[PDB]
């Protein structure tokens, strides 16, 4: 609550981010690696949304992030449109080992156009980049696609942490630019 | 953050207790829920109408792209159907329609309604035969077996549509409660007090608890619309959610591999070979894929992906996840508490 001897941390910005993309691509693992620095190989289905909090320092400012993971099965997705309310940035995730998840990126972009604010920021993430022998989605194809939309693109691994912090830092930098 | 781990204990505790409380209250919900008020009906109709307009605008923005436009039209048709169902309730609240039971006699509550009819319709019942027809037109059909059959079909269609409407009404009511929770959660997240931040997480648990009720209704709706079917523990078809362990598409099968059910298309099967598993079309086998590492890898990958689409009912899934999450947490705690001692 705050005394002179134990003060709660303040923040200069509070951004709401949503993770979307096919079930199984690693949205929850990205969330947990970034927010808690944990990882498990064991899959657990979602029955609804989740959020985590993490505060970062960027450009001399303190940014609190509330990061929401969306649900997977249609029966658990009734009020998806409500989670976009107040969202500053959407991170669209595919799985570099799964061509279908990449092809579906266009459907996820449609959901953003349908539900998000007009000024929302976007980032494309190709996850599971540690699975080198199982990769099927070509970097240059994905980079060209992101470039055609004017959005940033990173390949990540929630398992090894590759580019996980960078992804969120990049999204926060893009949002801050328009504040 | 060790303390985050230590806290997860009660956190998981609170989460699964909340989930189980909502699952147990489901049956009572069906009978005791509060009806939507007109204001609630209007709020949902406004929201769906705005969504409809947005989809229309996106279709224009994507003109020419048959595939994208078709996708947008599927969504738009879905929203149009929800709006028409809400319009029935609105009509009932304004007297343009009235609720009747199976004999065509008026009832007060949507709960007790079999059909909602307008002033130009009537219901005729005789010893378990049910007819819906234009008001005053019995003589036109009474000696015409084909026309009586049409009237019986019309009764059944209207009855089926109102059943859809009743489930959707409960969904909308719960949805509005959940949307209010999200505002309070945002207020709590704004706080720098970690105690308020923790309260937001507790409120999320109640939010997802209501989502479990939505999920059961969505499964009931899917089965009602003949998109999906319920199955018991042995994979035998059943009619009621109460007897179901699984729910899957009409185009799918419960495929038994190693004593576990995998939901795959009827035209697919799974092959086991020396510890590897391949999702294949019915006409393929080891002989047909042995010459193609590409086919093998894709089929293995496609089998691996099946875990992301469970066929379990909501209640069974929640129990399954509880076990898994608890086990992972206990493992982490055990390692933290003990490993350093050696
Ligand atoms: N090798 C590897 N596996 C991952 C990675 N991220 C996720 N996974 C695995 O892929 C599965 C699906 O991840 P999950 O976060 O639950 O997917 P979600 O449905 O998008 O939330 C999980 O069981 C993970 O164990 C990664 O970066 N590398």
Author numbering:
A (entry chain A): -2 to 176
B (entry chain B): 225 to 566
Quote the original article.
To reveal the molecular basis for the LidA-Rab1 interaction, we first solved the crystal structure of LidA(224-559) in complex with a constitutively GDP-bound mutant Rab1(S25N; 1-176) at 1.73 Å using molecular replacement. The overall LidA-Rab1 complex adopts a compact and globular structure. The interaction between LidA and Rab1 resulted in a 1∶1 stoichiometric complex and buried 41% (4031 Å2/9845 Å2) of the Rab1. In the structure, Rab1 is held in a large and pronounced groove made by the four “fingers” with an extensive, though not complete, charge and surface complementarities. Contacts between LidA and Rab1 are established through a combination of hydrogen bonds and hydrophobic interactions involving the switch I, switch II and the interswitch region of Rab1. LidA (residues 224-559) is composed of seven α-helices and ten β-strands, which arrange into a structure resembling a hand with the baby finger buried in the palm and the remaining four straightened. Unexpectedly, the structures showed that GDP-Rab1(S25N), a “constitutively” inactive mutant, adopted an active conformation when bound by LidA. Surprisingly, structural comparison revealed that the conformation of LidA-bound Rab1(S25N) is essentially identical with that of LidA-bound GTP-Rab1, indicating that Rab1(S25N) is in the active conformation following LidA binding. As with GTP, LidA binding induces striking structural remodeling around the switch I region of Rab1(S25N), which swings from the edge of β-sheet to the nucleotide-binding site, with the largest displacement of 9.2 Å at the Cα atom of Ile. Despite loss of the γ phosphate group-mediated interactions, the switch I region in Rab1(S25N) is stabilized through its interaction with α7 of LidA.
